[PDB]
Short mmCIF file of C-alpha atoms in Angstrom, two decimals:
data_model
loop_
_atom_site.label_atom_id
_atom_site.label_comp_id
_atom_site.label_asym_id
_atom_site.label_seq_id
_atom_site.Cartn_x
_atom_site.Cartn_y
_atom_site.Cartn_z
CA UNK A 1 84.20 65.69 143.79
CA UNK A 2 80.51 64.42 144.11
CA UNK A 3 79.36 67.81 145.04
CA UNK A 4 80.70 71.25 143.50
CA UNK A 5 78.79 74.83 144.15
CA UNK A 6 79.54 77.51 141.28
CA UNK A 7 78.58 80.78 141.54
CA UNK A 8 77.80 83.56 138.96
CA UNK A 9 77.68 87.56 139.06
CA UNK A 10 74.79 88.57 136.98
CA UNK A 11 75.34 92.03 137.91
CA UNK A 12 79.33 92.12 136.84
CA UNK A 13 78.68 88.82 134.40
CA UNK A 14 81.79 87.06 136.84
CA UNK A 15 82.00 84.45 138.91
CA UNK A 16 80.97 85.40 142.44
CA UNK A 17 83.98 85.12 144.36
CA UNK A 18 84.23 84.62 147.72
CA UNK A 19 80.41 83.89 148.33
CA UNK A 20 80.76 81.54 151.40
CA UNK A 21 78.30 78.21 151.21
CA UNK A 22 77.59 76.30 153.48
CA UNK A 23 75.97 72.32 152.78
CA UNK A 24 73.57 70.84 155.22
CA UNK A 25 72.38 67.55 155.54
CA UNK A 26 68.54 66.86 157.04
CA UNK A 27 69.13 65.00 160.04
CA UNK A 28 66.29 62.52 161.33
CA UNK A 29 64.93 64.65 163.48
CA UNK A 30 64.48 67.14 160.38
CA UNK A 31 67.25 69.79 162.18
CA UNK A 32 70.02 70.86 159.41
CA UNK A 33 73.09 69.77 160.41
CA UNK A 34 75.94 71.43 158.84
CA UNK A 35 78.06 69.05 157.03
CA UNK A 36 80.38 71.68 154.70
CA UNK A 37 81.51 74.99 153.88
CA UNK A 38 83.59 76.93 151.43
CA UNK A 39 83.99 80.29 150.06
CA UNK A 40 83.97 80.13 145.95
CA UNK A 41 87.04 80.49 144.40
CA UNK A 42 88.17 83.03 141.54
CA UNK A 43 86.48 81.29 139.35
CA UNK A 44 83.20 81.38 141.34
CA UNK A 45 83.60 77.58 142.32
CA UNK A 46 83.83 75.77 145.33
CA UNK A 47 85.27 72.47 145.45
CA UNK A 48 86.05 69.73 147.88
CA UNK A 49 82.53 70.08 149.80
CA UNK A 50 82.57 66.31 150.38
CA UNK A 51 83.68 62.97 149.06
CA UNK A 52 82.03 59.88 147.17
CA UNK A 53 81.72 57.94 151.10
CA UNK A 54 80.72 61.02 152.70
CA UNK A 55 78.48 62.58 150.59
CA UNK A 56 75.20 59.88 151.13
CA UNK A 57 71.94 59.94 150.36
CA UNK A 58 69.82 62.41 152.27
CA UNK A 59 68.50 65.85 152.00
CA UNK A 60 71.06 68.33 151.59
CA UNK A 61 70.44 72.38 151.33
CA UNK A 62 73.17 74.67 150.28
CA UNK A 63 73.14 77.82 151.45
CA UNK A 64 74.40 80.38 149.60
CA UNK A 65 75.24 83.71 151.22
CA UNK A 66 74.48 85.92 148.60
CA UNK A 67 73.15 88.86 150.89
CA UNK A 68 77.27 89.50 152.25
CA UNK A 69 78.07 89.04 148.44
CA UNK A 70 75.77 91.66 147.50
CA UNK A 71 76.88 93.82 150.49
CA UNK A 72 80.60 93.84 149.58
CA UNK A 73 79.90 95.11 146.23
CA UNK A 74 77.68 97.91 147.84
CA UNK A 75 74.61 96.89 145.91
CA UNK A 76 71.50 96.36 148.10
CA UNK A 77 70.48 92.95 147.85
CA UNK A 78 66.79 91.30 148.05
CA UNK A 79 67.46 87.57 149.53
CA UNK A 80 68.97 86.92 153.04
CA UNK A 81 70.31 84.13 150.58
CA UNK A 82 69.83 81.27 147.99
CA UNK A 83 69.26 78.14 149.54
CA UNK A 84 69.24 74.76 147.22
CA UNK A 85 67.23 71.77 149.06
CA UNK A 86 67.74 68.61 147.44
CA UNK A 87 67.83 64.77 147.94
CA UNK A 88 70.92 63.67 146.57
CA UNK A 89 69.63 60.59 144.41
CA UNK A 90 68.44 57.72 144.18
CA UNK A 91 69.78 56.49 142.21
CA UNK A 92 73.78 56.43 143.38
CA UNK A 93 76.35 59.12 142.58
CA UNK A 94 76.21 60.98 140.21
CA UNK A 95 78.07 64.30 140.68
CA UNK A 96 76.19 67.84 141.72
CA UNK A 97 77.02 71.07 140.16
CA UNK A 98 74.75 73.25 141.92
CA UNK A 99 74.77 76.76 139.73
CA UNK A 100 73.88 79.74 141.25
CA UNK A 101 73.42 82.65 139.18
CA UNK A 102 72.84 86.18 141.16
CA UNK A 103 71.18 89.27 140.84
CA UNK A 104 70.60 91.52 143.88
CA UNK A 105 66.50 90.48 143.17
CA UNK A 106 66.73 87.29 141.57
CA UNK A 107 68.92 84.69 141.36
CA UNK A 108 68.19 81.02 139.94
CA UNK A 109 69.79 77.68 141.14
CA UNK A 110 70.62 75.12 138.72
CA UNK A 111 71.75 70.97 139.28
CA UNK A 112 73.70 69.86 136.71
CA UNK A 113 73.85 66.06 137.43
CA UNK A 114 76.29 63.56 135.80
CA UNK A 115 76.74 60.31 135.54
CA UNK B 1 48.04 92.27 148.75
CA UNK B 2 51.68 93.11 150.17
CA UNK B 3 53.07 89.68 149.34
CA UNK B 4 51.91 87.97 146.58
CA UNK B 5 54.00 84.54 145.10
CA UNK B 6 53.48 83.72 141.60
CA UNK B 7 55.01 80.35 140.23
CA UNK B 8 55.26 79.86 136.44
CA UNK B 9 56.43 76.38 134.82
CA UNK B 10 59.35 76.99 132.58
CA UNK B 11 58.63 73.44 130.79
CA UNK B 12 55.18 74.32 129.85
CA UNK B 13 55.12 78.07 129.33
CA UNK B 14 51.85 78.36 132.25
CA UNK B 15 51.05 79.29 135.64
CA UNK B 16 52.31 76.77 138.14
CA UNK B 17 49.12 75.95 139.42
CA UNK B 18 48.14 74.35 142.57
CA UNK B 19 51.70 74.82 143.92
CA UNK B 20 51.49 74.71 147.82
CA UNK B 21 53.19 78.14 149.14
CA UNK B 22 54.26 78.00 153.07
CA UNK B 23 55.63 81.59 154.24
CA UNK B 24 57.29 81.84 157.70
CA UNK B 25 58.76 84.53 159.97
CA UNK B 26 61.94 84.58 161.79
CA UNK B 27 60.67 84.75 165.39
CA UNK B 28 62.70 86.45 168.24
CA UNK B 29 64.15 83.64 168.64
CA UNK B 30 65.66 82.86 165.54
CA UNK B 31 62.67 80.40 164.95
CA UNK B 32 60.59 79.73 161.68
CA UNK B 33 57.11 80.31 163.18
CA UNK B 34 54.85 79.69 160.57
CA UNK B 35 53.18 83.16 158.87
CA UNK B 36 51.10 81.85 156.23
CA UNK B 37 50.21 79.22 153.05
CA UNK B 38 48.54 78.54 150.40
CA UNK B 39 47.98 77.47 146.73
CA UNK B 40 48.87 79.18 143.96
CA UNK B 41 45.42 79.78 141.54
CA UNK B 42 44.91 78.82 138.01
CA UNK B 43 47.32 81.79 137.59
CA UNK B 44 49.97 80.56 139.28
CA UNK B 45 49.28 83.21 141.79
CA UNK B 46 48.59 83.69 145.16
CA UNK B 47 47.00 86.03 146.56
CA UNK B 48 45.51 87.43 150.09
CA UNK B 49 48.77 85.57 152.16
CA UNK B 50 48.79 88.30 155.00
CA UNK B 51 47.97 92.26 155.25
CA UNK B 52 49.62 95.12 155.47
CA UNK B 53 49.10 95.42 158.94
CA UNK B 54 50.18 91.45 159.71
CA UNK B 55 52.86 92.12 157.19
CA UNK B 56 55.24 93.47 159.28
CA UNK B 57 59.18 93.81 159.63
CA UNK B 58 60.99 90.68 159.51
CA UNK B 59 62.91 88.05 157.72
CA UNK B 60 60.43 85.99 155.92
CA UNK B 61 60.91 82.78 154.09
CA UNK B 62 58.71 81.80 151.28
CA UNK B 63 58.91 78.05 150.71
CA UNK B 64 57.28 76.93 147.18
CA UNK B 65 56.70 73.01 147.28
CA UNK B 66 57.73 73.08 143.67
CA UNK B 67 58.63 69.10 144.52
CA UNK B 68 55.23 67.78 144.54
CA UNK B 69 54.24 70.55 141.29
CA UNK B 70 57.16 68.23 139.80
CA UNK B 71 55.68 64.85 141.35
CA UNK B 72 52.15 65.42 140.43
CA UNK B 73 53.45 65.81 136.49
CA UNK B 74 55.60 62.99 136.54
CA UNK B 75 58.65 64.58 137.18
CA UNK B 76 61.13 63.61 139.68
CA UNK B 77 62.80 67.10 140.46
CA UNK B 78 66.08 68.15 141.76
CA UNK B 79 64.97 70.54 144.67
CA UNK B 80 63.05 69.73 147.56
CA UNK B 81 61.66 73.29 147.21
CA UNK B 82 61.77 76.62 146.25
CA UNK B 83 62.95 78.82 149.17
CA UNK B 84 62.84 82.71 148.99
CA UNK B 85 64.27 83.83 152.43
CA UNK B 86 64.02 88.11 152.52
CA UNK B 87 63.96 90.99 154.85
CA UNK B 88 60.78 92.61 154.60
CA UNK B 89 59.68 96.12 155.39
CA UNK B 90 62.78 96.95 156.53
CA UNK B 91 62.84 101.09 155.19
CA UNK B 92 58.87 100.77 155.27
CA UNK B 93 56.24 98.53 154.21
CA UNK B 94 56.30 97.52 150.50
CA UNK B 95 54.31 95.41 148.24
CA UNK B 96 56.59 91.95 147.34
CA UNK B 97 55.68 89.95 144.22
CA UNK B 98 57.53 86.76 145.06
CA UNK B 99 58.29 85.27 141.18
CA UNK B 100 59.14 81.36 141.14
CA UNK B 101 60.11 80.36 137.39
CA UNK B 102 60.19 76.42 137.37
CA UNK B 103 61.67 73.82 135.49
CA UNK B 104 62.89 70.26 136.72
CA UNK B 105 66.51 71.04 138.00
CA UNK B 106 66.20 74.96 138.24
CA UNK B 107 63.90 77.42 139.15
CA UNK B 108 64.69 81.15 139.76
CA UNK B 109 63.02 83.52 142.29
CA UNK B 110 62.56 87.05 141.12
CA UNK B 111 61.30 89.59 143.74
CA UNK B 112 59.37 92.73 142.44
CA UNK B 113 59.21 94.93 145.38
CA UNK B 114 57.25 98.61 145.27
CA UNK B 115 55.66 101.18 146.91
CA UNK B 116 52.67 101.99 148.29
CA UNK C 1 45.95 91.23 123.92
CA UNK C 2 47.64 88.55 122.66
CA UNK C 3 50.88 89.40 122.76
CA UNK C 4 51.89 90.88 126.09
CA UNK C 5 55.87 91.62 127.15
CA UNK C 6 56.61 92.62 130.37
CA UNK C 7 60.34 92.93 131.82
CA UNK C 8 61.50 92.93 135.12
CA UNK C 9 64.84 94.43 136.58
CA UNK C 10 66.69 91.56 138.55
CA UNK C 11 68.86 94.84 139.98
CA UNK C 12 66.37 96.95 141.77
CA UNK C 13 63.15 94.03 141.76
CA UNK C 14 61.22 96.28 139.98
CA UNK C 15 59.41 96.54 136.49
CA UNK C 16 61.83 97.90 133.76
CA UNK C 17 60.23 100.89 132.72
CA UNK C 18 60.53 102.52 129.49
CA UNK C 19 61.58 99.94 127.94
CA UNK C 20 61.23 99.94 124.13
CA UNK C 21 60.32 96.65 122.44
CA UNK C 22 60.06 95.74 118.69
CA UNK C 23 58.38 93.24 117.60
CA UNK C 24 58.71 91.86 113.93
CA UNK C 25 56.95 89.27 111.92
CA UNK C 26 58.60 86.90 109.57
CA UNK C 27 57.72 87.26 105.83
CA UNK C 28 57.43 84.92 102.91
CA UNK C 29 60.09 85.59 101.92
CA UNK C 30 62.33 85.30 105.32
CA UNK C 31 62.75 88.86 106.15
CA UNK C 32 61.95 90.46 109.36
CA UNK C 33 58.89 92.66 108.77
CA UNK C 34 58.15 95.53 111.77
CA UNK C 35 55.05 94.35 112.77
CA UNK C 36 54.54 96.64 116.65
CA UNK C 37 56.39 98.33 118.97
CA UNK C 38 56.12 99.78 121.82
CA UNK C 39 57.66 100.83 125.48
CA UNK C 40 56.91 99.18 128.39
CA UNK C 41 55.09 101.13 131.39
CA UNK C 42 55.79 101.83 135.04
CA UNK C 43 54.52 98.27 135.43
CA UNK C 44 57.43 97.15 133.40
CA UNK C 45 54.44 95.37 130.91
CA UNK C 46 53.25 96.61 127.19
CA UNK C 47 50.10 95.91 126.26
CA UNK C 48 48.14 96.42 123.20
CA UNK C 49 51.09 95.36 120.72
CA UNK C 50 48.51 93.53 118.59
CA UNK C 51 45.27 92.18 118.54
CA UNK C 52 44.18 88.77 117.88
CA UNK C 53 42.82 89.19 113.85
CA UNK C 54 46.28 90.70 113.37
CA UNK C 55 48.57 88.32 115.44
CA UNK C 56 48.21 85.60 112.77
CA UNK C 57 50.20 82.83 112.65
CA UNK C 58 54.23 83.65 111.95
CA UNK C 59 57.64 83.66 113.64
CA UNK C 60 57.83 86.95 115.14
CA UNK C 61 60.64 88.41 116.98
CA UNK C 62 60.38 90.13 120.73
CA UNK C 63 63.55 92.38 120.45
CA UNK C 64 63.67 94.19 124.09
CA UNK C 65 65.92 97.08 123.70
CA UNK C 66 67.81 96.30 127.05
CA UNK C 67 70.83 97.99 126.31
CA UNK C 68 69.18 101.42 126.14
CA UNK C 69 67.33 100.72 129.88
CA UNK C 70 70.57 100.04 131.68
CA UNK C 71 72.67 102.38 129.68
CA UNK C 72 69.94 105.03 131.44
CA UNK C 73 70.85 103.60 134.70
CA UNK C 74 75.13 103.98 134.06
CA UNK C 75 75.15 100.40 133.44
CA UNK C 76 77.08 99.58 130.49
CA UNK C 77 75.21 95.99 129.94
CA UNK C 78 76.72 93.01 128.07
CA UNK C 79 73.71 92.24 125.98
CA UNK C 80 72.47 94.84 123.18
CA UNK C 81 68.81 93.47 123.27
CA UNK C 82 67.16 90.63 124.77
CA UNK C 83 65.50 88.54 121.58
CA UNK C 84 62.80 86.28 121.78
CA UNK C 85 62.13 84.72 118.76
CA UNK C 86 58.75 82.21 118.72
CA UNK C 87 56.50 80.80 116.29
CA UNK C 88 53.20 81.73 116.88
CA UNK C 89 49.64 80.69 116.96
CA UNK C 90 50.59 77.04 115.00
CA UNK C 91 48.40 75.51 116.27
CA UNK C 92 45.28 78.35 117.14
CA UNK C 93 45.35 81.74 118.75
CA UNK C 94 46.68 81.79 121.91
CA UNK C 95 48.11 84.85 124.48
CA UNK C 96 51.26 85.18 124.92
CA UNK C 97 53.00 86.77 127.42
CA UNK C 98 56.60 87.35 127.01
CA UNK C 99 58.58 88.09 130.39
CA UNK C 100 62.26 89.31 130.42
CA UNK C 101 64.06 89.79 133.52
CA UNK C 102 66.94 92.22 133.05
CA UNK C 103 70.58 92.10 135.01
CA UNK C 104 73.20 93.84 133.08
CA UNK C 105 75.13 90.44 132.15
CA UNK C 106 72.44 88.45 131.71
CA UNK C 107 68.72 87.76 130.76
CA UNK C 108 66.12 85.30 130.55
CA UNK C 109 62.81 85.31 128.79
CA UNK C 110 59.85 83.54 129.87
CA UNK C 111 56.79 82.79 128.02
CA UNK C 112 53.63 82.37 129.28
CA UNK C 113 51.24 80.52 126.48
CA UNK C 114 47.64 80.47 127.13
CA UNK C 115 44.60 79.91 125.75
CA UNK C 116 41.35 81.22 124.76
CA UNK D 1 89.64 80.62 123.50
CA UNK D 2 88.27 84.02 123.76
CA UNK D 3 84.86 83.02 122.95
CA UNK D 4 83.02 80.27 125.09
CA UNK D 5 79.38 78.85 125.15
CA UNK D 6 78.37 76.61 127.41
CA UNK D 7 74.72 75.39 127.22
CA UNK D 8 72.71 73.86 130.25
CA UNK D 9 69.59 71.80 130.26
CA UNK D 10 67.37 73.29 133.10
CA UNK D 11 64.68 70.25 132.51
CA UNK D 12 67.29 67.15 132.67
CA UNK D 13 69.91 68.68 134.91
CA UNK D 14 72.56 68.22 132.65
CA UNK D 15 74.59 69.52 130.22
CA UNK D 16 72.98 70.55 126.58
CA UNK D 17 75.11 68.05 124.43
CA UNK D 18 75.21 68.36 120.93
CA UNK D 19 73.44 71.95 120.80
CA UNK D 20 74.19 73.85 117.27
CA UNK D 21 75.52 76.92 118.04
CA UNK D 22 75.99 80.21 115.54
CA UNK D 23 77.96 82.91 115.90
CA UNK D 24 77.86 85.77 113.84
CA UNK D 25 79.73 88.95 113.41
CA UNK D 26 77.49 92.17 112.43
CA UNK D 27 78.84 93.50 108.96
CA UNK D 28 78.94 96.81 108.02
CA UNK D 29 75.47 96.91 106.67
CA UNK D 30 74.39 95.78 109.75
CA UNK D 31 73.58 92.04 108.35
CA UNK D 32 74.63 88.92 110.79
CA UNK D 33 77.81 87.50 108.48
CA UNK D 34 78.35 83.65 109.66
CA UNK D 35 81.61 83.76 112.20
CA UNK D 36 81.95 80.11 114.06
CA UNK D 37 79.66 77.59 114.86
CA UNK D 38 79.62 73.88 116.65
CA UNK D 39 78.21 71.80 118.73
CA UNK D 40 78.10 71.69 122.26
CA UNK D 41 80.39 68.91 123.62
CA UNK D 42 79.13 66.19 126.30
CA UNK D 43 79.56 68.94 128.56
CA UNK D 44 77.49 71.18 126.90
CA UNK D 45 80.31 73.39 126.26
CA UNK D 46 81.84 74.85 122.74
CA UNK D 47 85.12 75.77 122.85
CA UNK D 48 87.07 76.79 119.89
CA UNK D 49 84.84 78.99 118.19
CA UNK D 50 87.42 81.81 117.66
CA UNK D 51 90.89 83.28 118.42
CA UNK D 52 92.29 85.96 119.90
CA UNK D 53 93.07 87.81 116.72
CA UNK D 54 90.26 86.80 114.77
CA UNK D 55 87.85 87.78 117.49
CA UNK D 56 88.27 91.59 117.11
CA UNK D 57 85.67 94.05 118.65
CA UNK D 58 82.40 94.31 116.99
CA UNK D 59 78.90 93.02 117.90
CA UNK D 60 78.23 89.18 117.58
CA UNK D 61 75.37 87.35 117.48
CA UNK D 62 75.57 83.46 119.14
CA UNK D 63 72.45 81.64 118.04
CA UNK D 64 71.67 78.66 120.08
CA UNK D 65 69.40 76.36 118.03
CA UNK D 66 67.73 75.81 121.58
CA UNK D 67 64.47 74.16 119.35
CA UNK D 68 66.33 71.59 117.30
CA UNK D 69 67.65 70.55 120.69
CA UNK D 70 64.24 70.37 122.19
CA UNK D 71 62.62 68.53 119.35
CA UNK D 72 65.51 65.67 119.44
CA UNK D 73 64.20 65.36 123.41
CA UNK D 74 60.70 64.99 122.30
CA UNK D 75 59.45 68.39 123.96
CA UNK D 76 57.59 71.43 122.65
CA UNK D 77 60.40 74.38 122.23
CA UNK D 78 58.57 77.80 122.54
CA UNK D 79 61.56 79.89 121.19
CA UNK D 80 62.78 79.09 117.87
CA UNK D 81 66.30 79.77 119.45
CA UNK D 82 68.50 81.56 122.28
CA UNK D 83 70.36 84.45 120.70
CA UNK D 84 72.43 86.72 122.27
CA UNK D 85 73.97 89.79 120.96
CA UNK D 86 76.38 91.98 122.21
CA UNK D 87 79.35 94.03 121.63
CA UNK D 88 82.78 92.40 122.22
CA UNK D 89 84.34 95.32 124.22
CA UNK D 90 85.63 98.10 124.74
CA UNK D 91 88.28 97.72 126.71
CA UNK D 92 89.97 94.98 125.17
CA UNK D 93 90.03 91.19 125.46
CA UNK D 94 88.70 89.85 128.22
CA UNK D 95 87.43 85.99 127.69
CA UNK D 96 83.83 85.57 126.85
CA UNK D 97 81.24 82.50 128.22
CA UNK D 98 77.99 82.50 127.08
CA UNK D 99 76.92 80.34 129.31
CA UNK D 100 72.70 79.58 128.80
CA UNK D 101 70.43 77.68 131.08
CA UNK D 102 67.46 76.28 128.68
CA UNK D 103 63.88 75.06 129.46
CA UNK D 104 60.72 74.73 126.82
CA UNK D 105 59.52 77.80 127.33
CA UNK D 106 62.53 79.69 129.08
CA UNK D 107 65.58 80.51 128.80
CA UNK D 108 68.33 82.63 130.47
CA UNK D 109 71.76 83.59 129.14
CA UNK D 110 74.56 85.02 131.04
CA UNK D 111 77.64 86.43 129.81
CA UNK D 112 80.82 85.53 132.33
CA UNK D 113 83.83 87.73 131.14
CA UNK D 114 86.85 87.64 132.68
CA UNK D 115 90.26 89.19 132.17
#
């Protein structure tokens, strides 16, 4: 699992569950190409995004759609949503946690990087 | 005046200065067409992006080169960027304060919105 | 002056108003000593806490009474307070702006050192 | 474990390994009696801490020692340490993380109950 997305309620302190993400890869003609999707899970993850061959250098951006989070819960949200734009390495893998921790104005996006 | 970005650098406890600020508008369209840039100030601010009147309803992004803030202190950051993507002026036009906080593998975006 | 705290509501995106903050000074000794408080205005900031002959060197303690703001708003919050805890002025007077931004299960507390 | 920290280094990306952690139970002349403590694992996580019945309601205090951890990286700490306080509920138990993000000169903590 080179890549993993977990989402957190600031608002409720829970995971976010069911926040869908999607994960795009730059392509060379600088046009995000979707490349995965999930919805967290219970425990405000989402696994399974990709795989060691799969997941390659390159940009990637995960989008996080926080606004239809926010909407569910009837709480007016600020962002359309929280979008993480990274290059995953050099140098190698290296696994992503990509935290996302929400408030309806503010949320911050962490990489936690190992190995 | 109604959108103003201030960056701060978690790591040092200071304005994020010099950070390169690109705002863009959805377009018709579905389009980024580009709405406005600039630096933030020895404040981390930046002021004087667009006007009320320019400033109208739409889904704006606010992209915060935080990367080359990162680069040009030696740091080899995790994101590409900052990205604050919002509906603005949707009930009315408001003032946005656009907050970046900043460190090397996180930053968080804050919005202060009021009225005018 | 030197000391500065200004909190932010990650809920609405707007300055937490009214929102009383003790600060206390470290003695000899190792007891907290009350050394300002204070409520924060419709700008979400509190100014005027200290002033620099009096903001001497110490470990003081920012203690935000965050509870009390969202319990105002029906929130029953997880945190009672958001603490800061710093040493200050070690090595020469500087400002020091303290930022909190409020959800009800979490905070986090920014400091913006300058100098003078 | 009804009591969880997890610690996160916003600067490295990684988890904050080896972070002392405090937790305190307020007495009933309101001073902070000593509770638990560790360190954060490799994974920046403390698990542990407390049990079920020990952990009864009342309002504890978890003291990160955020600047020792800091210092052993080589880079100026503003806060002397992350504490968070809060009452453990009403309405029962209910697992607690503490989970905290850490940088020099910021910090946020988030409180993920569940159950």
């Amino acid at each position: 699992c080179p890549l993993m997305v977990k989402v957190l309620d600031a608002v409720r302190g829970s995971p976010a569950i069911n926040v869908a993400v999607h994960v795009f890869r730059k392509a060379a003609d600088d046009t995000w190409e979707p490349f995965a999707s999930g919805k967290t899970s219970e425990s405000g993850e989402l696994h399974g995004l990709t795989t060691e061959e799969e997941f390659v250098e390159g940009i990637y951006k995960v989008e996080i759609d926080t606004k239809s989070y926010w909407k569910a819960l009837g709480i007016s949200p600020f962002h359309e949503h929280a979008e993480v734009v990274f290059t995953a390495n050099d140098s190698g893998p290296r696994r992503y946690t990509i935290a996302a921790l929400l408030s309806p104005y503010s949320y911050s996006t962490t990489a936690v990087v190992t190995n």
